[PDB]
Amino acid sequence: EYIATFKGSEYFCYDLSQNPIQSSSDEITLSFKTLQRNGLMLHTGKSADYVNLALKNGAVSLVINLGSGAFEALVEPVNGKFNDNAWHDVKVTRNLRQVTISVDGILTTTGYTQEDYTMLGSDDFFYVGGSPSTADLPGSPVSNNFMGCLKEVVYKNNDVRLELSRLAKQGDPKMKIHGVVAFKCENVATLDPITFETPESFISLPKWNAKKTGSISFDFRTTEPNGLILFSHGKPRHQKDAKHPQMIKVDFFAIEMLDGHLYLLLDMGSGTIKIKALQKKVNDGEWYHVDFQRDGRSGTISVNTLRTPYTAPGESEILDLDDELYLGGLPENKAGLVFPTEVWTALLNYGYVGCIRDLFIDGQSKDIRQMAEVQSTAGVKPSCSRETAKPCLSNPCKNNGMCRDGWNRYVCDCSGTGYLGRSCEREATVLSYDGSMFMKIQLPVVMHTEAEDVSLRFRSQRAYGILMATTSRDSADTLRLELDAGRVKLTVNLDCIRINKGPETLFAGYNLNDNEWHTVRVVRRGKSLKLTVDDQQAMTGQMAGDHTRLEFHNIETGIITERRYLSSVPSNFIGHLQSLTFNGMAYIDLCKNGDIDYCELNARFGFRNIIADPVTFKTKSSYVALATLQAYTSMHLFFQFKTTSLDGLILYNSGDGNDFIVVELVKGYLHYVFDLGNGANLIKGSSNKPLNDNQWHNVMISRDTSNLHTVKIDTKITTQITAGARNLDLKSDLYIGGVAKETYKSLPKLVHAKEGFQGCLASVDLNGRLPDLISDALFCNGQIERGCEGPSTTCQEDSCSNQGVCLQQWDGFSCDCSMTSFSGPLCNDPGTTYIFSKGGGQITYKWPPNDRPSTRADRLAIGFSTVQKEAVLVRVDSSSGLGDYLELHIHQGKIGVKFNVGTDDIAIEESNAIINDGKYHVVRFTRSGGNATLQVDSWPVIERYPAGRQLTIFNSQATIIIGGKEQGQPFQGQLSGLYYNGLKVLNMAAENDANIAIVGNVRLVGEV
Ligand SMILES: *[C@@H]1O[C@H](CO)[C@@H](O[C@@H]2O[C@H](CO)[C@@H](O)[C@H](O)[C@H]2NC(C)=O)[C@H](O)[C@H]1NC(C)=O
């Protein structure tokens, strides 16, 4: 008996080229044992002549071509199945073009080979149990090597009797046993199926060694609408993109789910191909069989049997994958890994979750419940179960998060809620923006995408302003969300090439400037845009020009800082944001918690009511004039004021004819007066009290395209509707906070004002533009002063407190403490003090070899107390081989300094002042080349001007040594607040600066 266990990845191989089979008669016998539904038992020959016998989804297939039109048979499972693990028999006989296939010896089928050929000629190879590629050999219906046991295999023809089961065992120099081996039976088989529990979970796979041809099959099961199943790329091509030379192009293929839809992706070196693998959505939570067969340019993709044609563009046949292939998602931060833009799910971090079994690569079963399964993958499990409890009953999403019933898990969509995290349990961080702050995520490498999900929540009082924006250093491409006249406006600009579009936009929402929070969600899939504010109905648009790919280097909020190529941009935001989410990154939170280091900003975290760049008008009569209001089609004004005065003109701008617009305070109440060609109207803003109670008020005044005017004061809307009128430009400059003295005597009809505004304006928004009231003024009158808090503090005789130097800044004075021996903002706190006690000590600063200073002017100050008569406090030496040094010492109870910059030594000594005394003294030394000066405490400055040839550079400074041990005169007392050319040497030492060594008896003091 000749029985042999076919391991799966093993097969027999006979060489017929020394004695060709070619025959008119012939006959084929064997018994088979298999659990599996497909597998090649055997095959011989190439082109037009072959004979091919194998199990095809549970039935015995047989193909014969004698040279001109095959005979195909597929004998059926009558009473039970063939994949039963029991023995079954095959007899195949053939007389000329006549074929009979017998099963177990009684399930016959008869037919003919086509046309007139009768000669089966094959001089290549005779395969048993599998092959180098099964989906290739001619007439194959399967693509699978055999798993299980084969018995008593024989091909008798009229001439020779190739008895293959026997010749393989007894050993023949014409029989090649390619891979594995195994020669008994009663040996069983099967391989486990697998569950990928989490998105991020993935299995790493052995290189698909494709080429011209390759095939793949596996089974899947899930209720997850989106996810990346299989993916693999080649090596980076020298053939660049025209538009994106920055974008790494590679050969590849992927299989992917996207909204329950199955998808195949191939790129072989010229253009991609996307294929709906099946019409119906496949996230049925039902098993599906997936064959993928490819042959150079063409191939088919098969779902439960239903095959779909493809041909990839261009003439590239080879699909050149190299190295690792991936199943169920991608790793994070594998360098070398390149995500091609065409593959949506890779770039949206939708790793697959669900079940996968029975994997075959080029015909060969790879078992997975081992793969990197027993090889330490996290979030993958042995068997595959479907938890009948619907997990969103678990009731798991907090705070009105939306719950999605997943695979074996629920998912939360926290986007609209102010929370994040698996269960919306984490409060989401708020960034707050006052019109001159930004928060900019600089991606660590450059993104290229064809598809996004972006959401964010904002609130603002302003009808305009940027929400979020992606930007490139290399072009003006951008995906951007912004407030535009109260609506949210999505803009998707993709830029040029071809020449010898416009922007594409959506709008959603109205009046979102109410200072309540709104959620905005953008989905892009290629040319499709979908935008949607809050719960309202989604607004959709198809983009038109056939570019889809978007390059970005940053995601920007607040200010658009990267705008090299735009001479103009949406205006800076003022309000708050929260829950920025961009292909699932929560950048605001990541940034705040420091989970990412590439986030850069000057927004402030946490919410606060904003007053944005407040400006003071000191006297009524002070006013500025700005360039003309630009209310084209609609108008949205906003500002805040704070005043103690009952009446003044606040905003005036006039037009052609009787046209004008005014905003004024009258007897405490706010009045918006205007005439747009139908005569003057007054609308009184609504409040019970006078508004000059020295608090900030918000004022918001707007005319829309229906001519509905609205005046809002703090929380109170007043609306009125006025006459339909060709809306016309204004003409005069735009005056704020008064007008020229002479003008009030002739302002329009119902304008009360005879005097300007006194008080503060802030957050001034003129129909989309945030002027800097002081800086953008065209001219000015009287005093407009920055801030809302009177003037900056200015320097006084007594301002700094230890001979600190008082310097003026724009926001009040500072004290330069450098030459005092002190610290703190008024030079009044003790400088960093070290106590040098008995037996000596030493703090050394050592410059790193290349930052060795070489100066023409030095200055050094330090504070000290000591009883000593002889001591070296501090010394600075040049590096090994040069003369130059500077040394502050106490010789004969008197403080002094000695230095050499390449000529003579120069001494300078405070001769008269007691300093070894026990009391605190400070000494300040300066030097300019040859000349130097010395001063202690309050003693007149001592100046030294050498005559003759002085060199001037203290060359290559290498160490500052404090303490005296080197120069053998240890210091003993207290050294405090030493400053040398910019270095605060003791602050440095008290902070473990790596270039500081401390040795010996020397202690850092406490503070108060
Ligand atoms: C060292 O000190 C002297 C003395 O004041 C400086 O020499 C004078 O420089 C001034 C301009 O500041 C000239 O008008 C004089 O002609 C110079 N007088 C002398 C005595 O030469 C000198 O420049 C200082 N040198 C350095 C390098 O700081």
If you measure from the C-alpha of residue 941 to the centroid of ligand 1, how many angstroms do you get, rounded to a whole number? 18
Closest residue CA from atom 8 of ligand 1: 945
Same-domain pairing of 615 and 605: no
If you measure from the C-alpha of residue 958 to the centroid of ligand 1, how many angstroms do you get, rounded to a whole number? 29
How many angstroms separate the CA atoms of 109 and 33, rounded?
22
Same-domain pairing of 738 and 861: no
CB atoms within 10 A of CB 941: 11
Output the domain CATH number for residue 329: 2.60.120.200
Q: Is the CB of 933 under 6 A from ligand 1?
A: no
Same-domain pairing of 69 and 162: yes
**Rg of the chain over CA atoms, in angstroms?**
43
If you measure from the C-alpha of residue 298 to the centroid of ligand 1, how many angstroms do you get, rounded to a whole number? 88
Q: Which ligand 1 atom lies nearest to the CA of residue 931?
A: 1
Same-domain pairing of 531 and 439: yes
Using CB atoms within 10 Å of the CB of residue 536, give its burial: 0 to 12 exposed, 13 to 18 middle, 19+ buried. exposed
Tokens of 571: 């205006």
Same-domain pairing of 651 and 771: yes
String of b and e for 306-317 (b: at least 16 CB within 10 Å)?
Answer: eebeeebeeebb
How many angstroms separate the CA atoms of 927 and 876, rounded?
14
Resolution of this model in Å is 3.0
Residue whose pair of structure tokens reads 């608090």 in the numeric block: 695
Q: Is the CB of 945 under 6 A from ligand 1?
A: yes
Out of 730, 762, 791, a domain closes at 791
User: Which phi and psi (to 5°) does residue 164 adopt?
Assistant: -70, -40
Indicate the top mutation candidate among 931, 933, 950, 951 to test ligand 1's pocket, ranked by most ligand atoms within 8 A of CB.
Answer: 931
User: Which phi and psi (to 5°) does residue 404 adopt?
Assistant: -115, 130
Q: Structural domain of residue 470, as residue ranges?
A: 428-610
Output the domain CATH number for residue 390: 2.10.25.10
Same-domain pairing of 507 and 618: no
**69 with 115: CB under 8 angstroms?**
yes
- Contacts for 655-662: CB closer than 8 Å, 24+ residues apart: 655/728, 655/729, 655/730, 655/731, 655/732, 656/728, 656/729, 656/731, 658/748, 659/728, 659/730, 659/731, 660/730, 660/748, 661/629, 661/631, 661/730, 662/747, 662/748, 662/751, 662/753
**388 with 223: CB under 8 angstroms?**
no
List residues bridging with 51 in a β-sheet: 44, 64
Closest residue CA from atom 28 of ligand 1: 928
Please name the residue ranges forming H helices in 276-370. Answer: 344-347
Same-domain pairing of 813 and 936: no
How many angstroms separate the CA atoms of 126 and 120, rounded?
13
Closest CA to 38 of 181, 110, 134: 134
Using CB atoms within 10 Å of the CB of residue 86, give its burial: 0 to 12 exposed, 13 to 18 middle, 19+ buried. exposed
**548 with 527: CB under 8 angstroms?**
yes
Tokens of 926: 């300066």
Out of 363, 393, 427, a domain closes at 427
Same-domain pairing of 239 and 376: yes
Indicate the top mutation candidate among 856, 906, 927, 945 to test ligand 1's pocket, ranked by most ligand atoms within 8 A of CB.
Answer: 945
Tokens of 87: 């023995």
| DSSP, residue by residue, 675-723 | ESSS--EEEE---SS-S-SSS-EEEEEEE-TT-EEEEEETTEEEEEE--
**868 with 971: CB under 8 angstroms?**
yes
Distance spanning both ends of the chain, measured CA to CA: 98
Residue whose pair of structure tokens reads 């609408």 in the numeric block: 225
Using CB atoms within 10 Å of the CB of residue 870, give its burial: 0 to 12 exposed, 13 to 18 middle, 19+ buried. middle
Residue 129: which residues within 8 A CB-CB, separation 6 or more?
4, 6, 10, 11, 12, 40, 41, 42, 145, 146, 150
How many angstroms separate the CA atoms of 45 and 447, rounded?
51
Same-domain pairing of 66 and 156: yes
Residue whose pair of structure tokens reads 């069983």 in the numeric block: 188
If you measure from the C-alpha of residue 931 to the centroid of ligand 1, how many angstroms do you get, rounded to a whole number? 9
Q: Is the CB of 929 under 6 A from ligand 1?
A: yes
Same-domain pairing of 756 and 779: yes
If you measure from the C-alpha of residue 494 to the centroid of ligand 1, how many angstroms do you get, rounded to a whole number? 65
How many angstroms separate the CA atoms of 442 and 587, rounded?
11
Closest residue CA from atom 2 of ligand 1: 945
**Structural domain count of the chain:** 7
**179 with 4: CB under 8 angstroms?**
no
Closest CA to 806 of 820, 816, 818, 793: 816
| DSSP, residue by residue, 482-540 | EEETTEEEEEEE----------EEEEE-S--TTSS-EEEEEEEETTEEEEEETTSPPEE
Closest residue CA from atom 19 of ligand 1: 947
Closest CA to 883 of 894, 869, 898: 898
- Looking at residue 529, its amino acid is L
If you measure from the C-alpha of residue 513 to the centroid of ligand 1, how many angstroms do you get, rounded to a whole number? 67
SS3 for 182-241 is CCCCCCCCCCCCEEECCCCCCEEECCCCCCCEEEEEEEEECCCCCEEEEEEECCCCCCCC
CB atoms within 10 A of CB 355: 22
Chain-centre distance for alpha carbon 803? 51
Same-domain pairing of 570 and 629: no
Q: Which ligand 1 atom lies nearest to the CA of residue 856?
A: 27
Residue ranges of the annotated binding site for Ca(2+) are 49, 66, 119, 477, 494, 549, 884, 901, 953, 955
Pairing of strands 681-684, 669-675: antiparallel
Q: Is the CB of 931 under 6 A from ligand 1?
A: yes
Q: What is the torsional sign of CA 372, 375, 380, 384?
A: positive
Q: Is the CB of 950 under 6 A from ligand 1?
A: no
Out of 562, 588, 610, a domain closes at 610
Residue whose pair of structure tokens reads 């060489």 in the numeric block: 15
**74 with 51: CB under 8 angstroms?**
no
**562 with 471: CB under 8 angstroms?**
yes
**215 with 363: CB under 8 angstroms?**
yes
How many angstroms separate the CA atoms of 704 and 721, rounded?
10
| DSSP, residue by residue, 122-163 | E-SEEEES--S-TTTSTT-S---B--EEEEEEEEE-SS-EE-
Helix (H, G, I), strand (E, B) or coil at 850: helix
If you measure from the C-alpha of residue 777 to the centroid of ligand 1, how many angstroms do you get, rounded to a whole number? 47
Same-domain pairing of 587 and 718: no
